[PDB]
């Protein structure tokens, strides 16, 4: 355990950063997906019709 700590004194600090990163990505990914699907709904509902005269 000690040698491990030695080879990575930041092990603990990092994992806290990773927990905050997972919480922030779990908040931000569906919201950015919702913004993309808003701005892409317009087209995804576009109905094309061919009306040769």
């Amino acid at each position: 355990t000690f040698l491990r700590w030695a080879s990575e004194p930041e092990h603990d600090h990092r994992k806290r950063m990773g927990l905050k990163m997972l919480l922030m990505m779990g908040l931000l990914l569906p919201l950015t997906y919702a913004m993309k699907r808003h701005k892409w709904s317009v087209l995804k509902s576009r109905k094309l019709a061919y009306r040769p005269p």
Partner: protein, 412 residues
């Protein structure tokens, strides 16, 4: 000093209004609260086809008898239909006032629809619809109405789908005639050299007994429409010019800030660029109809949008004063001519229920300042979803995200 518009009401319910002036060429006219908004997609061209046929043949005046009479006194006979109102009007001399009223009585009741005549008109209407497509701005405004009022009776058109026009039965027509021609929904309007008491007498004799009772109490009713922000982009690259209309939801007839919105239109690149305030009942479309070569529609859209936001954010007193002066010269009056004054009465009695005098219009114009203009413009233009209708080479016409987003200035 403008003479007041005097309104009376007959038992039937039809309102025989009038107005009087030194002029001697009166325009008598019947307005009916019946348009394509009251049609239920099975009779989508009934008002138009009755309009085309109403003049051609009445029971008392068989065949083209009416059009002869009208020729004998040298009078002019006109009719038009919108999405909400139908009008049958005659411009004549003053001394021919009785017979004209009698003629109008036949046109609204006792009319005869000759199945033969029905057929002849079918041709006329179908062919024109077949050539109506030629008029682009009409195509663009019909597209704007369709995409803005999707799923409602306000999307359809006065003309109606070709199908309904092909399939029409003397009986169907009879229904529309017997259903939407009720006496309480009718105004007999007169403008010019007419006496109100003589017109009120004539009204009863020839226009009494106008139907008022619906069948089996199938009393019509109406639906408040939805303004569905949406676009329609009829792309046809062979046309030389492109017509684009962008609108938002209007307030309606009875909402006074219309006046303020009119001033905003009076404040407002791509060839023609007219602003418009189509205002049906309980809804309307404020907006613009700009034609333009395919390479400038984009810029135009931006310019248009820019102007609007300027009116939502940075309206000054000088342009407001200019818009008020421009509006105060759109006042309709005897100098506008009878037909125009005639028409107003009919529309004023159908929509407001009364004739708004020009002094009240001037008061509502002079109470408009810059602060309430930018407040009302922010209420109706800022961050609103528009309806877009394009026809022609409209590839460089921006799609819906660029238009809508352009409606909000990141700097306010």
């Amino acid at each position: 000093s403008v003479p007041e518009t005097q309104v009376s009401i007959l038992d039937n319910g039809l309102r025989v209004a009038s107005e009087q002036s030194s002029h001697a060429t009166c325009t008598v006219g019947v307005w009916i609260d019946a348009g394509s908004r009251y049609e239920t997609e099975k009779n989508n061209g009934a008002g138009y086809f009755l309009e085309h046929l109403a003049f051609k043949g009445t029971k008392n005046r068989p065949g083209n008898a009416l059009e002869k009479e009208v020729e004998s006194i040298g009078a002019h006979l006109n009719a038009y239909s919108t999405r909400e109102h139908t009008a049958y009007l005659i411009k004549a001399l003053s001394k021919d006032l009785p017979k004209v009223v009698e003629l109008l009585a036949d046109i609204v009741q006792n009319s005869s629809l000759e199945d033969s005549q029905i057929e002849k008109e079918r041709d006329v209407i179908l062919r024109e619809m077949q050539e109506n497509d030629a008029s682009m701005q009409n195509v663009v405004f019909d597209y704007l109405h369709a995409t803005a009022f999707q799923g409602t009776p306000l999307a359809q058109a006065v003309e109606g789908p070709s199908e309904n026009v092909r399939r029409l039965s003397r009986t169907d027509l009879t229904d529309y005639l017997n259903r939407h021609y009720k006496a309480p929904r009718m105004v007999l309007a007169a403008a010019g050299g007419v006496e109100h008491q003589q017109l009120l007498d004539l009204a009863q004799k020839h226009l009494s007994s106008v139907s008022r009772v619906y069948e089996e109490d199938a009393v019509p009713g109406l639906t408040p429409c939805r303004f569905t922000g949406s676009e329609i982009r009829h792309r046809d690259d062979a046309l030389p010019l492109a017509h684009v209309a962008i609108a938002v939801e209007g307030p309606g007839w009875a909402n006074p800030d219309n006046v303020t919105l009119q001033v905003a239109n009076a404040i407002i690149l791509c060839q023609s660029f007219q602003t418009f305030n189509i205002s049906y009942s309980d809804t309307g479309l404020l907006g613009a109809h700009f034609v333009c070569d395919a390479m400038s529609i984009d810029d135009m859209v931006f310019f248009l949008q820019g102007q609007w936001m300027r009116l939502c954010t940075s309206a000054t007193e000088s342009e407001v004063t200019r818009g008020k002066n421009i509006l105060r010269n759109a006042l309709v009056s005897h100098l506008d001519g009878t037909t125009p004054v005639c028409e107003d009465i009919g529309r004023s009695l159908l929509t407001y229920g009364r004739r708004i005098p020009l002094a009240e219009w001037e008061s509502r114009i002079q109470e408009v300042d810059a602060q309430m203009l930018r407040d009302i413009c922010s209420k109706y233009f800022y961050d609103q979803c528009p309806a877009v209708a394009g026809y022609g080479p409209i590839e460089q016409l921006p799609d819906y995200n660029r238009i809508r987003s352009g409606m909000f200035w990141l700097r306010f």
